[PDB]
Structures are given as structure tokens and as C-alpha cells.
Amino acid sequence: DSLRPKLSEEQQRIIAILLDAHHKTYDPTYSDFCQFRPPVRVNDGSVTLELSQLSMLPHLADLVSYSIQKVIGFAKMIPGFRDLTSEDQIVLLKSSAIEVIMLRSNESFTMDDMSWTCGNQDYKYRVSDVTKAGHSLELIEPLIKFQVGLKKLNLHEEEHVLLMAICIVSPDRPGVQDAALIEAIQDRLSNTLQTYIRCRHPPPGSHLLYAKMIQKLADLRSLNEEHSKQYRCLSFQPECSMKLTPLVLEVFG
Ligand SMILES: C=C1/C(=C\C=C2/CCC[C@]3(C)[C@@H]([C@H](C)CCCC(C)(C)O)C[C@H](OC)[C@@H]23)C[C@@H](O)C[C@@H]1O
């Protein structure tokens, strides 16, 4: 029964463009990480101590700061994104920034030891570094289920960039104006994604895969709300702002 329309010229172009954008804004060598404030790991095998030292916060806050910059850059090259008013571009970036960081980071997440391996022991990031940045297990552990859940999809890079683009261009975000444009843009991306999956993804018995990807967008919303909860409390720490960046302040404040 399953019809399998071919990717259209436009759709193939969309994928090309998104692949090129990701390649321009996601360095797979991580050769910039050494420019961040150094990571510090001082023994904590304590919430009080966490908040007292915040040893990993300057380094991780720089990594998130750097990644938001990469994401803004990635957004600009999503076809259609420029046609939105800049006010709406900003709503979408601010609200998706942490979700996209969560998707993109999957390129460094390894199931070998359940860490984000960007090195080089110093830029290997584990659960325990996240807690050393002042967050708790209630965000960290689902973030790790999410990462694993996502590795096991074995996404083609075509789908991976399409999923970040769909994520960013979501019409149902607090404060959007032209929800209809965003939907129109998002729909251009989803249809491309649905078409690709049924042309280029084997077996296939997976009409399943699209649904699983859409569910990942939904897990992301929960994590986002929990990140935000925990950021709000993190910022109650005196002189915490110095350990952040102006951009992390604005995006999450
Ligand atoms: C960010 C990336 C990378 C790893 C991401 C990571 C690993 C370290 C902790 C992070 C950063 C979370 C914490 C909870 C964020 C804390 C932020 C703050 C202190 C402001 O509250 C968000 C996130 O999810 C994977 C985490 C490496 C590479 O794959 C590029 C990608 O761009």
C-alpha cells in the first residue's frame, strides 16, 4: 500500500543546504574547546559543595555559549528562516537553543561510556561534570536516556540536521507572531523529512521512524522546562553571573 513519492528537486536542495549549514557550524574535531575557560574537576563524590565551587560551570557555560552562537548561525541558513520577522527569529532561537544543543551534542555522545567525548580526557564530559556545574539528577538522568534513545535511532545525518531544523522552526512557542509562516516553514521541513525516511531509510518497516523522531521533539520540551527550572535556581547562587556569559544570561534569564 505504501506510496513512496520521490524527493523533489527542492527537497534534495533543502537537505543539501542543511547539510552544508551543519558542516559550517559543527566542528567534529572540537578544536575550539581549548579556548574556553579551563575545565576544573575538584572532588565532590555534595549539593552544598557543587554550588560552593561551581568548578565546571565556567567551562560548560562557555561550551553552551559557543554552541548557542553556532545554532544562531545554523538557523540563519535554514531555508525560510530569514523570511520571518527578526522578532520571531529571536523567539524561536531563545526557546529552542537548549533543545538544539541537546540534539547536536548527540554527535559527541558515545555509548562506550555514556559520555560526550570531545577529546582528550579534559573535554570528555560525564554526568559528574554536569553536577559540578550545579545541576541535579532530575535533569541529568533523563538527558542521558534521551541521548541514548536518540543514538539508537541511528539517524542518517540528513535526518539529524532536518530534526534540528524542525525543532528550531516550531510554530507553537511562547510569543510567536506569525505562527502560520513558521508552520509553513516547518511543514516544508517535515514533508522533506517524511519523504526522505520512506525513500532512503532501510529496511524499511519504519514508517515508525518519523513518529519516534516527533516523540524526541516532545521529550526535548520536558528537558527544556527542567533545564529552565534548574537554571533559575543556579542563578540564585551569588556571583554566579560571572561564571556564565552575557549570551547565556539573556537566552536563559
Ligand atoms: C554542547 C555540546 C556538547 C555537549 C553538551 C553537553 C555535555 C555537557 C553538559 C551540557 C552542556 C548540558 C548542561 C546541562 C547545560 C548547562 C547550562 C547552564 C549552566 C547554562 O545551565 C546541555 C547538554 O545536553 C547534551 C550537555 C559537545 C558537542 O557535541 C557540541 C554541543 O554543542
Q: Which amino acid is at 1?
A: D
> Would you say 171 and 182 are in contact if contact means Cβ atoms under 8 Å apart?
yes
Breaks in the chain (C–N > 2.5 Å) following residue: 45
- For the chain, the residue count is 253
The DSSP string of 104-125 is HGGGTEETTTTEEE-SSGGGEE
> Would you say 168 and 189 are in contact if contact means Cβ atoms under 8 Å apart?
no
> DSSP class of residue 135?
-
Residue nearest to atom 25 of ligand 1 (CA): 102
Walk me through the domains of the chain, giving residue ranges and CATH numbers: 1-253 (1.10.565.10)
Nearest Cα residue to 108 out of 123, 90, 87, 128: 123
Torsions phi, psi for 116 (to 5 deg) = -95, 110
Using a CB cutoff of 8 Å and minimum separation of 24, what contacts does 149-152 make? 149/216, 149/219, 150/103, 150/106, 150/109, 150/216, 151/106, 151/109, 151/111
Residue nearest to atom 24 of ligand 1 (CA): 102
> Would you say 136 and 50 are in contact if contact means Cβ atoms under 8 Å apart?
no
Residue 105 is assigned to a ligand binding site: no
Phi-psi category of 27—alpha, beta or left, where left has phi over 0 and alpha has psi -120 to 50? beta
- Burial class (CB within 10 angstroms; exposed 0-12, middle 13-18, buried 19+) of 151: middle
**How far is 196 from 85, CA to CA, in rounded Å?**
29
Q: Which amino acid is at 189?
A: L
Q: Is the preceding peptide bond at 120 cis, omega within 30 degrees of 0?
A: yes
Residue nearest to atom 31 of ligand 1 (CA): 105
Q: Kindly give the distance from the C-alpha atom of residue 227 to the centroid of ligand 1, in angstroms, as a whole number.
A: 11
Elucidated via: X-ray
**How far is 19 from 241, CA to CA, in rounded Å?**
35
Nearest Cα residue to 147 out of 174, 166, 125: 125
